[PDB]
Amino acid sequence: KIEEGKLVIWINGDKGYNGLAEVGKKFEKDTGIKVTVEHPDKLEEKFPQVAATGDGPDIIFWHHDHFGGYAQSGLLAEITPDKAFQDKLYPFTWDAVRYNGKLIAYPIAVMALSLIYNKDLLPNPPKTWEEIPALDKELKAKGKSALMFNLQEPEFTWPLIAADGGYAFKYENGKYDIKDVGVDNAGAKAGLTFLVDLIKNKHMNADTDYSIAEAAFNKGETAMTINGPWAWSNIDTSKVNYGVTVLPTFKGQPSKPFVGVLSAGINAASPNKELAKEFLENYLLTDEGLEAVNKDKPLGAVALKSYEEELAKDPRIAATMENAQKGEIMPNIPQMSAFEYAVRTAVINAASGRQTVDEALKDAQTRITK
């Protein structure tokens, strides 16, 4: 079982764990409570294993959508921030950590895709998807293309498809209606048709994937790409003079990317729930706390209003949060699995001609709602 009188924290070792450990040291100095941070390989898979036998870390950091499965297994303790604390973070982030009407984790950071552009090729990036065709023809005259991004995964194609009305699962009253899927409505059809038309008109290639798109942008062959905060470092090394901004609109409406929320949950079997809450609320989710974590490894945008306003001074972070706020929270229900499979196939089939847009989405909708 977990030891009382101390805190063990788990988080992927590639994130700012050193920062969390520093906040832990500060905690130990003020309370005498030792905080040990660990980053086991595949800790996300190990948590349910050790948590089952009443073992594991007191606190676990991971993406919100995954906490859904954890909460269904009752592995997470319900957190109870007072209204004063909840007001410290952006409202939409609390929605990401709510399971069956209960709050099961503290939101930490927010990730979402943004439009990334080459400032030398396009000092002023386009605000609309509609302009992409004309922009590409202009750039092609100079041996450059307008846009290249991963068309193989729903995470990257969904922003446009959802813009005019598409959606995964209808969210209402803090609950997802698994029988109300918006994959084959008029909005989704319009979005995918535009995407497919771009391919038919040679402005994009159906085979472009993550690596192909990243190489093209980082080598200055294409003026724009679509990616997240995790791709910036690779661009920094390429020396490309890039900018990060709000995604283009479609039919005057904002692209809606899925939003991922790094969250901190408390082990249901932890005998240190009170101290765990004190650490997270009064030490980590503070400007100094998040700053320590962010300096170790960039968090992207954060859920804490006060610190996000500071980080937002970086236009890349401001763009990340803007797209996140206009986006769709990644559903934390098991049905998203079918949604991902279904939509990935639908997009590939429509982009290749194997199916029309209407047929591809109709089949995806059917499967998802089965």
Shortest approach of Zn ion to residue 285 CB, angstroms?
18
Adjacent-strand bridge partners of 302: 109
Instruction: Indicate the residue among 1 and 295 with the shorter CB distance to Zn ion.
Output: 1
Interacting residues toward Zn ion by CB under 5 A: 1, 13, 39, 63
Whose tokens are 């159906």? That residue is 206
Shortest approach of Zn ion to residue 274 CB, angstroms?
19
Residue type, 8: V
Instruction: Indicate the residue among 13 and 220 with the shorter CB distance to Zn ion.
Output: 13
Instruction: Indicate the residue among 14 and 172 with the shorter CB distance to Zn ion.
Output: 14
Shortest approach of Zn ion to residue 43 CB, angstroms?
8
Which tokens sit at 7?
Answer: 């805190």
Shortest approach of Zn ion to residue 33 CB, angstroms?
17
8 A C-beta contact, residue 114 and residue 245: yes
Instruction: Indicate the residue among 254 and 260 with the shorter CB distance to Zn ion.
Output: 260
Shortest approach of Zn ion to residue 243 CB, angstroms?
24
Whose tokens are 């930490």? That residue is 108
Shortest approach of Zn ion to residue 3 CB, angstroms?
6
Instruction: Indicate the residue among 108 and 351 with the shorter CB distance to Zn ion.
Output: 108
Shortest approach of Zn ion to residue 63 CB, angstroms?
3
Distance CA 346, CA 359 (A): 8
- Strand segments, DSSP code E, in the chain are 6-10, 34-38, 59-63, 98-99, 102-103, 106-111, 114-118, 145-147, 167-172, 175-182, 222-227, 242-245, 249-250, 253-254, 258-266, 301-302, 328-329
Distance CA 271, CA 7 (A): 10
Distance CA 298, CA 278 (A): 24
Distance CA 291, CA 257 (A): 26
Distance CA 361, CA 86 (A): 39
Instruction: Indicate the residue among 299 and 357 with the shorter CB distance to Zn ion.
Output: 299
Shortest approach of Zn ion to residue 252 CB, angstroms?
32
Instruction: Indicate the residue among 63 and 144 with the shorter CB distance to Zn ion.
Output: 63
Distance CA 120, CA 117 (A): 9
Instruction: Indicate the residue among 192 and 231 with the shorter CB distance to Zn ion.
Output: 231
Distance CA 111, CA 60 (A): 18
Rounded to 5 degrees, what are φ and ψ at 151?
-95, 0
